[PDB]
Amino acid sequence: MSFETLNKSFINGKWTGGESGRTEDILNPYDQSVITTASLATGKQLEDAFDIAQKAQKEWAKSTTEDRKAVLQKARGYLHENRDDIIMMIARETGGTIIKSTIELEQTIAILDEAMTYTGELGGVKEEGKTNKIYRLPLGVISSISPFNFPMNLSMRSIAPAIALGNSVVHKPDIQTAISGGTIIAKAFEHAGLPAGVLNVMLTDVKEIGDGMLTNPIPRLISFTGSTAVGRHIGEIAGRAFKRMALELGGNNPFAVLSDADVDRAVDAAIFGKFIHQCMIINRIIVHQDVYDEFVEKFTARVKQLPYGDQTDPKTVVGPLINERQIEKALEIIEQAKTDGIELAVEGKRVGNVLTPYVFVGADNNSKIAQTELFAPIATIIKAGSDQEAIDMANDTEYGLSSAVFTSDLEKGEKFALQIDSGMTHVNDNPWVVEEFTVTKWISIQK
Amino acid sequence: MSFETLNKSFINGKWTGGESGRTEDILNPYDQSVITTASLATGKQLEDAFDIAQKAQKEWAKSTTEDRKAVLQKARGYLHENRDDIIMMIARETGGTIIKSTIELEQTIAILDEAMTYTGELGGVKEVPSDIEGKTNKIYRLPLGVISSISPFNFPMNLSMRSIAPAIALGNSVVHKPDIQTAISGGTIIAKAFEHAGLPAGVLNVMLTDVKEIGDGMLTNPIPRLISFTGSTAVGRHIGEIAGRAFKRMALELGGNNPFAVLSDADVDRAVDAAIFGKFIHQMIINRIIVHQDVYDEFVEKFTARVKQLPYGDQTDPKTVVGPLINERQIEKALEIIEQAKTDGIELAVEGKRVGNVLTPYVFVGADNNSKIAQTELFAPIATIIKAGSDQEAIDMANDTEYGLSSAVFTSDLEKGEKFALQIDSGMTHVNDQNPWVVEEFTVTKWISIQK
Structure with a gap:
């Protein structure tokens, strides 16, 4: 000891x-x-x-x-x-x-x-x-x-x-x-x-x-x-x-939420995957237009209630980043996404050496922020026109290690996971x- | 057609x-x-x-x-x-x-x-x-x-x-x-x-x-x-x-420096034969041939005599064994290597020659395993025979290469061959074949x- x-x-x-x-x-x-x-x-x-x-x-x-x-x-x-x-x-x-x-x-x-x-x-x-x-x-x-x-x-x-x-x-x-x-x-x-x-x-x-x-x-x-x-x-x-x-x-791991997603559970998985468990490392959250507004709203509100600070306090969810250099890396990425016009649903701060959560919404799957491996409590939500498009936006990356797809139809989750060009996929995570x-x-x- | x-x-x-x-x-x-x-x-x-x-x-x-x-x-x-x-x-x-x-x-x-x-x-x-x-x-x-x-x-x-x-x-x-x-x-x-x-x-x-x-x-x-x-x-x-x-x-x-090891208990006749097929007929490329001491002189005589017979010439002829090298750059490369071993002192039991774009087999004997002709990839009808004072050295000499893909070991003792085979850094070893x-x-x- x-x-x-x-x-x-x-x-x-x-x-x-x-x-x-x-x-x-x-x-x-x-x-x-x-x-x-x-x-x-x-x-x-x-x-x-x-x-x-x-x-x-x-x-x-x-x-x-x-x-x-x-x-x-x-x-x-x-x-x-x-x-x-x-x-x-x-x-x-x-x-x-x-x-x-x-x-x-x-x-x-x-x-x-x-x-x-x-x-x-x-x-x-x-x-x-x-x-x-x-x-x-x-x-x-x-x-x-x-x-x-x-x-x-x-x-x-x-x-x-x-x-x-x-x-x-x-x-x-x-x-x-x-x-x-x-x-x-x-x-x-x-x-x-x-x-x-x-x-x-x-x-x-x-x-x-x-x-x-x-x-x-x-x-x-x-x-x-x-x-x-x-x-x-x-x-x-x-x-x-x-x-x-x-x-x-x-990797740049896509989390895809389909038309028939149970949304609360998707929010849970996304929040837990992105922050608490810090699953895979989640960067892009691709959501189907029909459940987009709802998912954004709940995710956003659940993110803003996450406690941050001292990691040694059991109540803490978002702890500090490892060092200065990583904080600067996340900030440069965040500055760049801001000058690109991407909306910030949740804007965080640097507090001591903790970066509090950011949530960017309505981003292009091709945007610089979406196509970046980050390791920061930064989330990027992306609207997909259809389930097929969600799957393709997921494929549109050069780094695929993992992926997640949320859908009520487990059969169709499996057919879609097979189309994701990656070694692992989780259907309902x-x-x-x-x-x-x-x-x-x-x-x-x-x- | x-x-x-x-x-x-x-x-x-x-x-x-x-x-x-x-x-x-x-x-x-x-x-x-x-x-x-x-x-x-x-x-x-x-x-x-x-x-x-x-x-x-x-x-x-x-x-x-x-x-x-x-x-x-x-x-x-x-x-x-x-x-x-x-x-x-x-x-x-x-x-x-x-x-x-x-x-x-x-x-x-x-x-x-x-x-x-x-x-x-x-x-x-x-x-x-x-x-x-x-x-x-x-x-x-x-x-x-x-x-x-x-x-x-x-x-x-x-x-x-x-x-x-x-x-x-x-x-x-x-x-x-x-x-x-x-x-x-x-x-x-x-x-x-x-x-x-x-x-x-x-x-x-x-x-x-x-x-x-x-x-x-x-x-x-x-x-x-x-x-x-x-x-x-x-x-x-x-x-x-x-x-x-x-x-x-x-x-x-x-x-691609594949060793052929011929241990003390090996059947020599099988080993000479299998070394000819591999080195001359099939061409798994046998670059250097390592032969234990008590059976060395027997292997050389037999391997040399047999190599000297092999038909050379037009490769479209169904009884030709040694045909032409792929191009002229290969011949110059082969010959310069042969000059290297000559100036280096290494004996040449069998001396080949250049007929058009065919070179006839050369056999160098009593070479160091740490030699230029031994360590070099060629894909030419050049054989190099190396003396080993033990079966362990033979296997040691086989190991000591830039890399090993395939190897061959010849021994009368099939348990002994498998255990030595297990001692060679090489994906594949054959015992008494190829x-x-x-x-x-x-x-x-x-x-x-x-x-x-």
Whole structure:
């Protein structure tokens, strides 16, 4: 319950100071107070870490199903037994509310449970004088990067299966969320007796390491979550080295409300999806003309009653943004939409480091504000002429990760979801992981 | 049967001349004689083709299983009925031997036979209903969209069809670019086959062009969702960067240093034989051959004697083993490499020579695994034999390559071969020789949650 102590890189089963001579003060983004001070690791220390991970993995690739299922279970136990303090810390460092923070811890725990489920997945499938043995083997070293939003959740999304499948990990969280994004998790794994070097958490920054996490020839996978513009950068470096990539990108996710929507429920989903749960990340809310005025009115009034302020207060829904730079980003976007004439149904303010909700209405699906991945409590409502047009406006974007469609007709929701060019869709709002973190090897044997 | 008539692009169901002004003579490698002349299509034409492929794919996605099996059947049917003429043409264009060409036409047919088994795959699975009551999670198997497909001058037809047939099977469309020098066997014949089969206009587009016209056109167009490529590593990196930046999928196959390991307990005679078929008849390219010490001298003598016999010359002759190299730049490249190893000290057990555009086999022996001739991709009839002092070193030496795609191990102990096979960083190992992974490559997984 003294996580602030956990301010160092974890390399080789040992807490290590950064030898860069620099520090980052990690702040509560609501009040700008220091939670803790972290020394930053070097370009050399990262290199040593990947070496160490390469070594440790050759051993970890030979551990039993037992040990691995065991390490994960103890690690999950550590998190669960300490859930109260961890949720608090997550909220402090992250600026996510107690509600959001709880969901993140639990999601993290669920990942661990899920990963226990495929620990025994390293055997062989035994398939005209020939015979064909298919084998599932560990990939190698994995390079893991997580962002400032949902940092614990998204870290474990890589760290858990990696370890579950005989891999090793060099993990780098955003420094401003290092504790939630790396050092708590590192403690759980140490606690659970993870062999030295199978998990390395790096407290560092760009000034120190450049593209060190992407450029090193050792790792055979870059797992990343963050913006698409950083994605593009990672994707170009990795493709060029022929590294496998597990990219999860924020996207421009359309929330479509159809002619036959139950509106109250749509409002609920939109409010909860956009702010409380902060589902997917919602940017554009496309609504059918026949229920437009109603949906706008109720959404607008429900938005204006959302409490904002200190995230550590259970009543708070909209907490501060992570830092200055993100506040400026949201403001520039908001200024631009204003000079473009787009109406502001709800106009917010900068209060300290909290940006209060904005709601833009009657926007073009093609407008600059509609076509922007934001991560701010900014909503853009867009009128659609028909259900077909709602579906097409949803398609008119280059970033589709997720989508939501609200409709009373579940059959027709499903036919419409199939037309949305995206991996996931929710109508009224498991095996493929193993594959990302393993090599299927083929041996043909002759008579 | 006048396959030289097929010197055009096949765009949107039509034989379409090139609009660039420029033309290239497609040559027989042995004598430099002109098979046809092909007009080169333009950047603009390629963009039309991608545009056209995107449209046709929306409609092709709506095809039934039967529609799709029928198209493949008539396609495989066209190639088998016409096997004799096709084999001849693959040989003429490509400089590959009638034997090599027959194997290639056969493998191409095999690929079409295989596609039919999974054309059925485009349908929805349910599972994992979530903790929430009233919630249903459904996964559907849908087409990817438009495939960008690029093939090289060696094994043009086989490699092209390795992308064309699954693509079309799984409701995709395709813009395809063979090396102009092998456009007939790498493109036009295939287009003729699918046309014969009543494949809708626009679903298969074959571009006769060159990079001089098209620059990175196959790579940069926002349309296609997968780039399929076989060729050099440096072009690979160039594709990886462009496709990585744009988040397109990529099926890259890159040269290509395949080790042949021959362990102490191996049957030598089987191993010499299998090394000849792989290195000379079939051409999976065996670059360097690694042979354990106690069986080394026996392998060399046998492998050398046998290589010395092989028939060289006109590749259209059904008993020629070593035909011409694809072009003159390949010969100069081969010879300069051979000079490199000579000045470097490496023994030459068997010395080849240049007859016209044919080079006769060269065998270098007792080479370092860390040698220029050992580490280099060539695709020339050059073999390199490397001494190993243990079976573990043999396998170590096989590993130590820029990259490994395929490997071969020869051992009497089948348990030992499988366990060493497991120790090589390579997708495939065969012991004593020489598809659901594809369905995932050419389809997308769509997930839908519904709520009651």
